Amino acid sequence: GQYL
Amino acid sequence: GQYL
Amino acid sequence: GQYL
Amino acid sequence: GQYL
Amino acid sequence: TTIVALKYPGGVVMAGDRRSTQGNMISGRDVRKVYITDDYTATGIAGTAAVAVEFARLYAVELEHYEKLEGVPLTFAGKINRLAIMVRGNLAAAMQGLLALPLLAGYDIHASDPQSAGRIVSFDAAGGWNIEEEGYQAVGSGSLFAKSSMKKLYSQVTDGDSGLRVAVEALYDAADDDSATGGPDLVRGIFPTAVIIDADGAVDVPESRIAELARAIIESRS
Amino acid sequence: TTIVALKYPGGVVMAGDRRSTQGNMISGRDVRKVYITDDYTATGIAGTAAVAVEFARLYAVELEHYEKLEGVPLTFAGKINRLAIMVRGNLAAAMQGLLALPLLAGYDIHASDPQSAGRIVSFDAAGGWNIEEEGYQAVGSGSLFAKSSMKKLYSQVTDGDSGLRVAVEALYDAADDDSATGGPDLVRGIFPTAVIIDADGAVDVPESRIAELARAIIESRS
Amino acid sequence: TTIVALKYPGGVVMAGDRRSTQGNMISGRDVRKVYITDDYTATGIAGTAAVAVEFARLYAVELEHYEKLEGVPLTFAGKINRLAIMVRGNLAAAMQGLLALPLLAGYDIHASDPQSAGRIVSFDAAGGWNIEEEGYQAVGSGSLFAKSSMKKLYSQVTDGDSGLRVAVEALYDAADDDSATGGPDLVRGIFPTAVIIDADGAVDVPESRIAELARAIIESRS
Amino acid sequence: SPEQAMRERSELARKGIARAKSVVALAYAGGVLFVAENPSRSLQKISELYDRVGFAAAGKFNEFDNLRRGGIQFADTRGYAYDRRDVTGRQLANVYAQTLGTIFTEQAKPYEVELCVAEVAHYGETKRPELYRITYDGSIADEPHFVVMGGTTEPIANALKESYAENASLTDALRIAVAALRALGVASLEVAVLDANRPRRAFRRITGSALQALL
Amino acid sequence: SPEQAMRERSELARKGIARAKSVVALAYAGGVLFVAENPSRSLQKISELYDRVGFAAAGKFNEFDNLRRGGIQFADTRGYAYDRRDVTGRQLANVYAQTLGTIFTEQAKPYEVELCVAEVAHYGETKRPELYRITYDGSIADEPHFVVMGGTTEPIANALKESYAENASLTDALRIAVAALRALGVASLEVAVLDANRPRRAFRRITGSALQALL
Amino acid sequence: SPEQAMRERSELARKGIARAKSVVALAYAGGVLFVAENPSRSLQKISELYDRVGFAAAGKFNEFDNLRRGGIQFADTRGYAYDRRDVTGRQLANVYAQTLGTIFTEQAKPYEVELCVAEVAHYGETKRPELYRITYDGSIADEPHFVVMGGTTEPIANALKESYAENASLTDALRIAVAALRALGVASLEVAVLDANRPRRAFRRITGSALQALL
Amino acid sequence: SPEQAMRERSELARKGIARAKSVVALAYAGGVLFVAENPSRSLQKISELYDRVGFAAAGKFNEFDNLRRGGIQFADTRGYAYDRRDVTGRQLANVYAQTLGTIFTEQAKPYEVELCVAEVAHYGETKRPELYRITYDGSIADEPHFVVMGGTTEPIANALKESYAENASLTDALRIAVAALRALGVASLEVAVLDANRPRRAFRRITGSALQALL
């Protein structure tokens, strides 16, 4: 998760 | 078990 | 990649 | 290869 | 150096001078040698300045660490034990000259009688400890003069304030007969530091009170 | 060697001589002993030349490394601590003769009053440190003469420039009474080095200013 | 032993004698003490013969190794550093008697002014180094006599050849006042060795030139 | 397939997070307030981490408890090396996320936990309370007002969305938090604060008779 | 089959790279300009690596962040061993590529990251800014004018292709970069420069009021 | 599937727990009473753990016995490091649960055991007896009155539910416990107490002729 | 089957070798000439190995580059132990082959590389240049006149077969090599020589304006  |  |  |  | 500690009805008081030397040379005029390691214990350390400040810091850390992990402070017995183990650990370096001796004052909340829940504990270089029961203790180069002063002055101790005055006086006599212990500097306004522990915890005595007591003693002797 | 540091209203100044000896033999006429370790701290080191330059270099690296990892410089307290730990680490070699003592000057940006945000910190061979509060400090073979000079000259310090002149004079007296400290060489044009730190950071004093101050002192004494 | 090095406008020259002793006994009449470690640096080493030749060999290997890996030589600063680290590494054995001190001459291609791109660097037993700026340096048992000779003769240095003659003369005076340094042997035809470095690299001075200079000096003194 | 397995793992983690007691943390005038639904008297889901940094969690007790211990560990050593005022809620929030992600990728079962790290300003300084939420994968989110963890988070989050008021006193924020949590009885409530007014250690539990009087 | 698995891995990596915030780096008169679309205030995608070497990345934060740390690590040790002016953008660009390739071949999941290493000349010297782009496999490309990373790179790359001008000032290059990036608001923008005019440390962030005034 | 395997493991553990001798522990006036159905004279299911902390178990003897030893081990070292009055029934109850959970997750077969840790107050102090039950997975439950372990627990638990009386003497609590356990003969009974009146070591077995006289 | 797998591996290696830039090495009057088709300015496929031993490669850059480093490593240590004139092109050619064979047998993917090790005589001595070609499996072949590596080798090898002339000067051998390589532009050409006339280090690159003048 927490893609950026 | 022991969910919290 | 970076074939050389 | 290089049989000998 | 000299650090005195004495019980009074309902609490304990612990005071220390301010000088730090190298040989005959006065190198520090305002060192603080008495720390509040926790809400119910203060610790004085005589000896090598580095080892002293380090002991105090690390011990405070350890007390509070166990408190955070287990949700309850150690008993006064456990605290005594950990301090003793630290002291025993520094023994090799103490033979090499880096000796540091702690004097531990605490107020046991779990004791039966509140009027005698005060606690004074003394250590040697080999980690053995002893629970003082004649009402007072001291450590450092001036300790003998301080104890011999408190032996006579101790019948005057009846409360927190009289106990504080007796502490300051004992320090004054230590300094009066030993050159490594600094007395009240009236010129620069630097006085001994003091910590009072009772049922409500540990608080630093504000400087003004110590200043007045010191001036009273000095005028009494003139 | 001799390195003086003194606070002035609004900043700190730190100056050092230039000689380096081997026994009675003058071996270096232009060594620089005061480094700008970061935008708000300068570090002087007395003692073995190798250990000194190495300390300065490595400490600067470490300050800046933590700054790059965490995105914010350490507080002045953390800096003091790291320097102290380095010094404590060199203790074994200092007993073998490779002793190096640092004097650390800094300007605390986080202090409450800007006029007294200056900071001077002194260390012993055993890593203990002390925050100087009588306004000045020095280290090296000429340190006693330098301090005894600044004690008298220090009431003249009112700003950055007067503080600089007092620094240069203190160095002049150190050199005047000790042979291991070099004075201003008028023949070769080599003068002490100086660093000034204030609200805007640390800058090296350009040589001309130190030259004029030194010539003023020398003509005053003739 | 004695190895001198001096800058001249546009380059650097480095010369060394040929004797090697054991006590009072002359054991080698033709040792070569100045090596061309690379196209822009020559290295002289005084001291224990084994440690000396080993230093020179290994340092040359390391310079060239990094050059082959990275495709570009180190800067003169990096070279100075590696040599210093080697020297610092031999310190334990130098206290046991196997001391070897290097003097490093180089021509910085990256310097701004070509006429002053010459570089002389001296080391102590503890790995500290110093960039010489009074124009000349020497190492070995005759170094003091050589330096005191060059101090007077150095105003004569104006080019590569005059600088070479001054080098040879300085060696002649070293040998003249110290017995561990060999002078020009006219009987066997053995003369000091010399290396010249300028914009075009490092070349060994062919023996004939040194022979003529030595004969000129010797006839001048008769 | 691996992607399918990953999806299954995510679903399992979600289920684990869902079947748990709910915790809320919200900013109020004196700092930050943690209010958790907790029946046991020994097992706790709110904890001091450092002087001004608090911690709440929801999921599997042994695991969230284990993270609690790891977090306590890191701060003390860091403080000793540098100093107390150098440890920040941000650094701690970061450590947990990285550890969780790596751990999940290399371990067998993902930690069915949801974390909230809270920080307030020091004594005599002004700064807004910071709340971070760290999820089971390593994701970290910066919350301005309140965090809700564990169980069904939608109704509690909405009730808080209507009732929240910045600079609410301790009693009002407690009423809002218990009310939105109900979306209970004096017993089985774990309540603590990060009181910004304390000199050093800001964390402080509110239990028993005083709590009853407040409610 | 192994080849099929490799193709699947490449597709997965591509997907990971695609769903991410876009970053641009371009040469301008005073050095190099990094402009990234970044909402968070704590998490950053642009960083100093060494005195004159900067770094931008796009993908999965924990991984690109981890490379950031590894790169910082290598430069300091190298500088201490030899010197500051010996560490170059080229050596660093190379290290990341080799590490990435080996890591991908021996690890489980490939790093869904895209890197850009930038370098400018030292103080008082003339030399053109160098931009390198390192992709997830280890490939490295030398860029003369600008690099675009993460998200949909085609429209931004084309808009820059029309708007780019060598020796554009700082304000013009900022307008061009924000405009081509839109293909936004003052908030959630991470802007930094490699200012060639600084004496030593060239990296410098441009945040807040000054940035607002510029835009 | 993994979930199916987990369900199977749980069923196996349940079966193992079910086919075993029954043990009961209940609070009475002088402390806590352990009454187990045990035919052997050498193999025991009730044990001293520390000064005021007792232990009963039901399942597979070698495993529950092994936990017995581990628990004894931890307390002595802890006491030596800090002190005797610092070891509490709570800390021990906690250690077993964590160990059991981790062990089950990483081992091959789960421990077919059920544990009960009991604690009473020290000499000259007033405090209620504490009973904890730790199950095979790591779950821990706080019991106010009595614990029943192993075999068919329903009838014994109900008979105790009707017969239990707080502050029952030693003889009455023994009659209640043997009666509810029957739901026997003087032989094959293992009976011990945590007598709160003892100065230091509270655990005390009740065997032979005295037991016969009592019953 | 294993044999089938081996055949597949060989095919994969062949494909890798085929899709690559072509390199040629040929003997001429002053030594040996390496001419490679190389667009990048930083990445190189021709390298010094030791005083008189040169090296060219074609395939995957990170791997052939890695061998380059290993070869450099072995020679320096060997020379230090014995001497510079003891390291020969033959010993180096041998080491690579053995390493490649063992590595391929124990590793996962075979090195998609093709190597050419070249050697010339020392200063003031007469001896014919020696060219060895080492293939991905470990096979090594002794070439009298020229080696062609990578890409489609047939047309280049034939064009060289017609144009080659022993004792051709540097300019003629360069024309022949570029012509047969075309079977190009001044840019993107990597040209170096093993000049037998140099005193010690024989390898020497021919780049820029001088190369343009020659061509």
Coordinates of C-alpha atoms in Angstrom, one line a residue, chain F residues 63-203:
Chain F
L63 CA 27.1 16.6 12.6
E64 CA 26.4 17.0 8.9
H65 CA 25.5 13.3 8.5
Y66 CA 22.8 13.3 11.1
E67 CA 21.6 16.6 9.6
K68 CA 21.2 14.9 6.2
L69 CA 19.4 11.8 7.6
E70 CA 16.9 13.6 9.9
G71 CA 16.4 16.8 8.0
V72 CA 17.2 19.0 11.1
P73 CA 20.5 19.8 12.9
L74 CA 20.9 18.4 16.4
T75 CA 20.3 20.7 19.3
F76 CA 23.4 22.3 20.9
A77 CA 23.0 19.7 23.6
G78 CA 23.3 16.8 21.2
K79 CA 26.3 18.3 19.5
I80 CA 28.0 18.7 23.0
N81 CA 27.2 15.1 23.7
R82 CA 28.7 13.7 20.5
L83 CA 31.9 15.7 20.8
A84 CA 32.2 14.5 24.4
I85 CA 31.8 10.9 23.3
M86 CA 34.6 11.3 20.7
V87 CA 36.9 12.8 23.4
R88 CA 36.1 10.0 25.8
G89 CA 37.0 7.6 23.0
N90 CA 40.5 9.0 22.6
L91 CA 41.2 8.5 26.3
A92 CA 43.3 5.3 25.9
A93 CA 45.6 7.0 23.3
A94 CA 45.7 10.2 25.4
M95 CA 47.3 8.3 28.3
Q96 CA 49.8 7.0 25.7
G97 CA 50.6 10.6 24.8
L98 CA 48.2 11.3 21.9
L99 CA 46.1 13.8 23.9
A100 CA 43.7 16.2 22.1
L101 CA 41.4 18.6 23.9
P102 CA 38.6 20.5 22.1
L103 CA 37.0 23.8 22.9
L104 CA 33.6 24.2 21.3
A105 CA 32.0 27.6 20.5
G106 CA 28.4 27.8 19.2
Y107 CA 25.5 30.1 18.7
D108 CA 22.2 28.5 19.9
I109 CA 19.5 29.5 17.5
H110 CA 16.9 28.0 19.8
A111 CA 17.9 29.9 22.9
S112 CA 15.3 32.4 24.3
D113 CA 17.4 35.6 24.5
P114 CA 19.4 36.3 21.3
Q115 CA 21.8 38.6 23.2
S116 CA 23.0 35.6 25.3
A117 CA 22.6 32.7 22.9
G118 CA 26.4 32.4 22.7
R119 CA 27.8 29.2 24.0
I120 CA 31.3 28.1 25.2
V121 CA 32.0 24.5 26.2
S122 CA 35.2 23.0 27.5
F123 CA 36.3 19.4 27.8
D124 CA 38.9 17.4 29.7
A125 CA 40.7 14.3 28.6
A126 CA 38.0 12.0 30.2
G127 CA 35.2 13.4 28.1
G128 CA 33.4 15.3 30.8
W129 CA 32.3 18.8 29.7
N130 CA 31.4 22.0 31.3
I131 CA 29.3 25.0 30.0
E132 CA 31.3 28.1 30.7
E133 CA 29.4 30.9 32.3
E134 CA 32.0 33.5 33.3
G135 CA 32.2 34.6 29.7
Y136 CA 35.4 33.2 28.2
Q137 CA 37.6 30.1 28.0
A138 CA 40.9 29.0 26.6
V139 CA 42.9 25.8 26.0
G140 CA 46.5 24.9 25.4
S141 CA 49.9 25.6 26.9
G142 CA 49.2 29.3 27.1
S143 CA 45.7 29.0 28.4
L144 CA 46.5 30.2 31.9
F145 CA 48.1 33.4 30.7
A146 CA 45.3 34.0 28.3
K147 CA 42.5 33.5 30.9
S148 CA 44.3 35.8 33.4
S149 CA 44.5 38.4 30.6
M150 CA 40.9 38.1 29.7
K151 CA 39.7 38.4 33.3
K152 CA 41.0 41.9 33.3
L153 CA 40.3 42.9 29.7
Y154 CA 36.7 41.5 29.6
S155 CA 34.9 44.5 30.9
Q156 CA 35.9 46.2 27.6
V157 CA 33.9 43.7 25.5
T158 CA 30.8 45.4 24.2
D159 CA 30.3 44.1 20.6
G160 CA 31.8 41.9 17.9
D161 CA 34.8 44.1 17.2
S162 CA 35.8 44.9 20.8
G163 CA 35.4 41.2 21.6
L164 CA 37.7 40.4 18.6
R165 CA 40.4 42.9 19.9
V166 CA 40.3 41.4 23.4
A167 CA 40.7 37.9 21.9
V168 CA 43.8 39.0 19.9
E169 CA 45.3 40.7 22.9
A170 CA 44.8 37.6 25.1
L171 CA 46.6 35.6 22.5
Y172 CA 49.4 38.2 22.5
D173 CA 49.9 37.8 26.2
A174 CA 49.8 34.0 26.0
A175 CA 52.6 34.1 23.4
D176 CA 54.4 36.8 25.5
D177 CA 54.9 34.5 28.5
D178 CA 55.0 31.1 26.8
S179 CA 57.4 30.0 24.1
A180 CA 55.2 27.2 22.5
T181 CA 52.7 29.9 21.5
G182 CA 53.5 32.0 18.5
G183 CA 52.7 35.7 18.4
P184 CA 52.0 37.9 15.4
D185 CA 54.9 37.6 13.0
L186 CA 55.3 41.0 11.5
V187 CA 58.1 39.9 9.2
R188 CA 56.3 37.1 7.4
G189 CA 52.8 38.6 7.9
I190 CA 51.3 35.6 9.7
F191 CA 48.6 36.5 12.3
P192 CA 46.2 34.5 14.5
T193 CA 43.1 33.0 12.9
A194 CA 39.6 34.0 14.1
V195 CA 36.0 32.9 13.6
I196 CA 32.9 34.9 14.5
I197 CA 29.6 33.3 15.1
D198 CA 26.3 35.3 15.5
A199 CA 22.7 35.1 14.5
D200 CA 23.7 34.8 10.8
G201 CA 26.1 31.9 11.2
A202 CA 29.9 31.5 11.3
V203 CA 32.4 33.4 9.2

